Known about the structure:
The protein is α+β, with helices and mostly antiparallel strands.
Amino acid sequence: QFPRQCATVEALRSGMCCPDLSPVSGPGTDRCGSSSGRGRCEAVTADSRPHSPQYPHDGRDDREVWPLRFFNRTCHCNGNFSGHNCGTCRPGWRGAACDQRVLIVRRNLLDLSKEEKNHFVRALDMAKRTTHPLFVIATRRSEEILGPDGNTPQFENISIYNYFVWTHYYSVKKTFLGVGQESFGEVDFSHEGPAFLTWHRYHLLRLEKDMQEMLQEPSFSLPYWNFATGKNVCDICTDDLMGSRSNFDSTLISPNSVFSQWRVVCDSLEDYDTLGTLCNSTEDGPIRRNPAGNVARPMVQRLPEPQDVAQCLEVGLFDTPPFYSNSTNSFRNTVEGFSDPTGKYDPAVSSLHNLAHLFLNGTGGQVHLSPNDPIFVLLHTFTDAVFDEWLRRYNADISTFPLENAPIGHNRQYNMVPFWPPVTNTEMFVTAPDNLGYTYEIQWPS
Ligand SMILES: *[C@@H]1O[C@H](CO[C@@H]2O[C@@H](C)[C@@H](O)[C@@H](O)[C@@H]2O)[C@@H](O[C@@H]2O[C@H](CO)[C@@H](O)[C@H](O)[C@H]2NC(C)=O)[C@H](O)[C@H]1NC(C)=O
Ligand SMILES: *[C@@H]1O[C@H](CO)[C@@H](O)[C@H](O)[C@H]1NC(C)=O
Ligand SMILES: *[C@@H]1O[C@H](CO)[C@@H](O)[C@H](O)[C@H]1NC(C)=O
Ligand SMILES: *[C@@H]1O[C@H](CO)[C@@H](O)[C@H](O)[C@H]1NC(C)=O
Ligand SMILES: *[C@@H]1O[C@H](CO)[C@@H](O)[C@H](O)[C@H]1NC(C)=O
Ligand SMILES: N[C@@H](Cn1ccc(=O)c(O)c1)C(=O)O
Ligand SMILES: [Zn+2]
Ligand SMILES: [Zn+2]
Ligand SMILES: [Zn+2]
């Protein structure tokens, strides 16, 4: 979403989000750090290819051709510099000149020392309560973004972790068609299409980086949850990790865990989809969670089996037509969970990543809310670990990731909504250890 210095009347009217870095001659003198060698303001590269006919409302939705409905000028950073104003480094690099390589290791949450488990839980809690130093979130769509008097940008500060929740919400929300009109819901810029794995990869990378700067710990890494154990239970739902079941309410988190104190954002869909507003930073109810608790649906009362992971890593084409939730023999769709681990599509199956979500029977099972439950982080670093092993094994074969006719948001060169600066799926479609400064300490079934 947008840097606070671009969430201004001047910046939105200009269409330029190219903030200063260290201006020593007055405002606008070091845009993108162009005084040093760090970058320059330039025109936005956005995808103009066609999308699937599934979305019929071209011209109605601020997320189309991201980010041109807000800005047509951005920073492009030189070399291994990065960031909204080219003041930081690309993933895997540090130092004033972005020339010292780092490689952080993402580990199984269960393998961490007692002090590392407690350090991770507290870091997450700190992110829930700490204002994001860079990004603010829109509470209204572009037509109303400048406020009633036209001079009051409709943005709020938001914590580090709630920003992580908000961008996921924004990527899946419905297209508002107007008061009286029913919002359009056959659209999802981060699921049910090829961009699912690259989108969620950046999502994790952005939270990880934000927590490193919040902690001043360059090497801090996000753990993962191996949910492919075939278990009846959630083995990370203990009070030293993520929280156990409350004994006073089967659907709440134990009061002995800090997560029972969390209050969710973005749980007012009926307001957003009838008044055309957006999720803001005001929190509401508690996390609801009830592992295996969906008696109405026995298929989602057990977690994937270890053999589900091995099977899906044998699917060698990243994605297949129609590049949607009903694709067959698509690794993307298999690991996402709409096909079975062998690639066979079945409207009645949920497996792997989808199954782990549904197994929570709660806040984590609803796509517009699920990052509110911090299991989401661990569930998706695991999905990313699977994705990374695929990248290794099939040599990052981006060839079946379609350039056009995907569901909207999912063309290969689409800028992943709503990340800032603009970042394509392509930039994420690389093996992490050589290209993104992280790797997984994990071994696969065989
Ligand atoms: C690049 O953007 C400028 C600024 O326009 C804004 O960009 C988007 C947020 C979009 O929502 C526009 O409505 C915003 O106005 C464009 O310059 C303006 O263009 C509009 C009509 O397009 C015109 O009425 C204004 O007079 C222009 N204002 C200024 C300060 O020039 C510019 O045309 C865009 N260039 C592109 C898209 O190639
Ligand atoms: C954002 O937070 C700043 C402090 O970082 C505070 O001064 C202000 O209330 C907020 N500004 C906007 C535009 O939301
Ligand atoms: C934030 O969202 C809630 C729920 O829709 C809403 O009632 C409230 O008015 C919103 N706040 C702002 C400032 O729009
Ligand atoms: C949880 O499962 C029950 C049935 O056992 C179902 O009625 C309810 O909708 C589910 N809730 C969520 C959030 O999945
Ligand atoms: C997948 O779903 C779309 C939209 O419902 C449909 O047009 C397409 O034919 C489906 N493909 C299948 C079921 O193979
Ligand atoms: N919608 C999916 C389940 N699901 C729920 C929450 C999510 O975040 C997600 O990514 C997927 C399904 O129908 O199986
Ligand atoms: Zn350039
Ligand atoms: Zn998701
Ligand atoms: Zn998910």
